[PDB]
Design a binder for this molecule. Structure first.
Ligand code: FE2
Length: 271
């Protein structure tokens, strides 16, 4: 029987939906911890010794896992690189591939394929379940985009605190004008925040996508100084691990974006 290690919350959703009850899904770090903050611990490193495989993002969102494997009782534990077939943006790679439907479909497939070689007695079911999960994801996207009447206007500029939504917004045909955090998971300095606030003003940035999971203080200040409309998105990293979390949280993100586009594209009449 298979014991599969996962690093982030969406990967628990991918692996749980591929295996069903044919394997155990084992989170590497505890639920409740912020994966950006998490500093490898003794008990967590010992757990790797109980695993057979570890499913990694490996593009910059689980470096802690690559480190905790090297100090484990299994330094040469079979590793699955979930983003092996995923086209990335932009040495500076955005690791938030999991906050995109098409990028998730490629990761689910890569995972089910590689798990199939490790457990050949269940490769049939893993392929079978990956097609089932993908269908639920394609429809999730389809329904969100079916609620969008008009495409955003030429002047529809968007900004985000965390550099996590470049992949999500790509599926709407949108680009992020500005990211408030200078580097991934790095809080800006007051000098940095003043320049960002100055750039959102110069470029007439319409909406700002803040964090639901681990919010920032400086958000009210950005909203105050620039008059930009605030909307919140989920990195899918807070609380409990579950099979449904990814598709649950993701559908909300897709409707927040649909809401943000429609709330700008508000049509009036007469006189
Ligand atoms: Fe992140």
């Amino acid at each position: 029987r298979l014991r599969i290690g996962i690093t982030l919350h969406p990967y628990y959703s991918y692996v749980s939906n591929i295996v069903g009850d044919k394997a155990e899904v084992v989170p590497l770090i505890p639920a409740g911890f912020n994966p950006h903050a998490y500093e490898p611990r003794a008990e967590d490193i010992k757990r790797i010794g109980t695993l057979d495989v570890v499913v990694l993002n490996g593009v910059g969102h689980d470096d802690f896992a690559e480190r905790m494997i090297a100090s484990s009782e299994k330094p040469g534990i079979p590793v699955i690189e979930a983003n092996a077939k995923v086209p990335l943006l932009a040495k500076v790679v955005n690791p938030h591939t999991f906050l995109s439907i098409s990028a998730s479909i490629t990761q689910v497939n890569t995972i089910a394929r590689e798990l199939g070689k490790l457990d050949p007695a269940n490769a049939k079911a893993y392929t079978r379940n990956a097609r089932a999960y993908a269908k639920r994801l394609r429809a999730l996207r389809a329904d969100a985009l079916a609620r969008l009447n008009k495409a955003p206007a030429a002047d529809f500029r968007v900004a985000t605190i965390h550099g996590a939504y470049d992949y999500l917004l790509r599926e709407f045909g949108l680009e992020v004008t500005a990211v408030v955090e200078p580097a991934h998971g790095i809080e800006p300095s007051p000098s940095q925040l003043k320049k960002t606030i100055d750039q959102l003003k110069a470029l007439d940035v319409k909406v700002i996508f803040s964090e639901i999971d681990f919010p920032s203080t400086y958000v009210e200040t950005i909203q105050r100084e620039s008059g930009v409309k605030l909307y919140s998105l989920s990195h899918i990293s807070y609380g409990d691990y579950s099979a449904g979390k990814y598709e649950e949280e993701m559908a909300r993100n897709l409707d927040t974006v649909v809401r943000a586009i429609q709330e700008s594209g508000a049509e009036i009449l007469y006189f």
